[PDB]
Motif scaffolding. Structure first.
Motif, short mmCIF file in Angstrom:
data_model
loop_
_atom_site.label_atom_id
_atom_site.label_comp_id
_atom_site.label_asym_id
_atom_site.label_seq_id
_atom_site.Cartn_x
_atom_site.Cartn_y
_atom_site.Cartn_z
N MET A 1 45.30 73.12 134.06
CA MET A 1 45.82 74.48 134.25
C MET A 1 46.09 75.16 132.91
N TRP A 2 46.55 74.41 131.92
CA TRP A 2 46.74 74.97 130.58
C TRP A 2 45.40 75.23 129.91
N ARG A 3 44.38 74.43 130.24
CA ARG A 3 43.07 74.59 129.59
C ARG A 3 42.28 75.74 130.20
N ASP B 1 43.93 79.41 129.77
CA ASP B 1 43.81 79.90 128.40
C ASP B 1 42.35 80.17 128.04
N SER C 1 47.43 65.52 134.69
CA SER C 1 46.08 65.96 134.36
C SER C 1 45.79 67.32 134.98
N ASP C 2 46.27 67.55 136.20
CA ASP C 2 46.05 68.84 136.85
C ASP C 2 46.66 69.97 136.03
N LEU C 3 47.88 69.77 135.53
CA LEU C 3 48.51 70.82 134.73
C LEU C 3 47.89 70.91 133.34
N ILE C 4 47.42 69.80 132.79
CA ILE C 4 46.63 69.88 131.57
C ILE C 4 45.46 70.83 131.80
N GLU D 1 36.91 73.52 119.44
CA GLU D 1 37.57 74.41 120.38
C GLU D 1 37.09 75.84 120.17
N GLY D 2 36.90 76.56 121.27
CA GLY D 2 36.36 77.90 121.23
C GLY D 2 34.86 77.99 121.39
N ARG E 1 40.67 83.63 129.00
CA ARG E 1 41.05 84.88 128.34
C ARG E 1 39.86 85.82 128.36
#
Lengths: 55, 287, 55, 55
Positions: free
Chosen positions: C19-21, C24, C14-17, C45-46, C27
């Motif tokens: 980190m990907w969220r 990104d 979940s932590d790396l999920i 999304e967005g 931006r």
């Protein structure tokens, strides 16, 4: 709205390198100058040019 | 269900032994016939859980000379096939996971029986769930052993022939019994039909042999001790964990995989069970 | 002052999920508008709204 | 130009905790002040001072 979540962990190392490199680049978003073409020579790490070539 | 017995000659002067059995704990024993001695040996070293041929040395082997390649050998609860034999050194090659069995750990000292062509069979048919009491009486040129001195034993029938065979080739992400998987989980299993195989011994390394009429595959997913997900009615040769439940269950570093075949609610006598460790992004980054 | 360091190597997917969220998403830290209530419909999304409801 | 890429996977834990701490800090790059010497006392998580001492 775009997303990169849910990577199949088989190709996890490539995404790990992605997290390394983009995070490294995020110290300061600086561009040495706008370019309409990719510099074919005289570029190295730390060189960031805005590729605004037609397309 | 059918009953069979195996024995080892106590002395070189014993020719054969008589089979005596009765239903339950009461009644009079009825002679069922006689059988020859079953060659057997002791494992000098442990037999690891691994499919395919394995070299094992035998100690205190008896009647090793009469053993023949292609026979069916049973140890503990696993049926294996002999590929090669070394008379002088008593070293033989065994095929793991054959017939309706799966590989299992066998500590040093386990007894190996080459029951093929050396077993005493009672022709009477007995239904599942019945407990029997049988004794083996030695026979010699001087006469027969007095039943009072014969050891007693009991067995519980379980309809071994009735239950469908378990899946065969059990490869995870291209590896057999791996403790390391990099992210995506892929499990492949083989479909075994008892009727088609007939008397042929097929190990786990062999590929698909077609399914059985009305036979499917069921998989149970556990969290080490607790049951979380259960997938039944599987008919393919591979299964992948859906992404939907990955978040709900979160990361599962310790995953227990249970595989079995079920038809008309009849579960296979044996099954696969191993706890695997997962690696990759989001798994085991404490180090 | 806060941190997300202390945690076992078991439940960090979940932590790396995240980190990907977060990475990104960062931006460009842009909000489509301030909202006193979470949009119950018409979001994907967005879409980023400042949830400024009472509490 | 600098990078932190391509480390031996054996020691990836150290640099992952590293990037975790840096990502946690990147919520808002704020400095409580400029200091010519590292504060030897009265500092905790969330305290950021610009170490501009000679050297």
């Amino acid at each position: 709205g775009l997303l990169i979540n849910g990577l199949p962990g088989e190709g996890h190392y490539s995404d790990l390198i992605r997290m390394w490199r983009w995070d490294d680049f995020l110290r300061q978003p600086v561009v040495k100058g706008r370019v309409a073409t990719l510099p074919t020579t005289g570029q190295a790490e730390g060189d960031t040019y805005i590729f605004t070539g037609s397309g | 269900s059918y009953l069979a017995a195996l024995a080892e000659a106590p002395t070189s002067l014993s020719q054969s032994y008589t089979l005596t059995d009765r239903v339950g704990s009461s009644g009079a024993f009825v002679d069922r016939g006689t059988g020859d001695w079953c060659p057997t040996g002791l494992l000098a070293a442990e037999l690891p859980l691994a499919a395919g041929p394995n070299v094992v040395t035998l100690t205190n082997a008896t009647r090793l000379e009469d053993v023949t390649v292609g026979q069916a050998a049973v140890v503990d609860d696993e049926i294996v096939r002999v590929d090669a034999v070394n008379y002088a050194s008593g070293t033989v090659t065994l095929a793991r996971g054959c017939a309706d069995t799966v590989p299992a750990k066998h500590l040093a000292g386990a007894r190996v029986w080459f029951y093929d062509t050396f077993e005493a069979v009672d022709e009477t048919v007995y239904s599942q769930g019945v407990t029997l009491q049988a004794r083996l009486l030695t026979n010699t040129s001087e006469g027969q052993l007095a039943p009072a001195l014969a050891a007693t034993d009991s067995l519980t029938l379980t309809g071994r022939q009735g239950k469908p065979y378990p899946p065969g080739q059990f490869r995870i992400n291209g590896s057999a019994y791996p403790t390391k998987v990099y992210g995506a989980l892929s499990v492949s299993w083989a479909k075994r039909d008892r009727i088609g195989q007939a008397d042929q011994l097929i190990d786990t390394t062999v590929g698909n042999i077609g399914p059985e009429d009305g036979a499917t595959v069921t998989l149970q997913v556990y969290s080490g001790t607790t049951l979380k997900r259960t997938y039944a009615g599987l008919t393919s040769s591979s299964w992948s964990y859906p992404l939907a439940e990955d978040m709900a269950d979160g990361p599962l570093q310790d995953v227990r995989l249970v595989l079995r075949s079920v038809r008309d609610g009849i579960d296979s006598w044996q099954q696969h069970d191993i706890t695997i460790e997962r690696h990759g992004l989001g798994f085991r980054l404490g180090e």
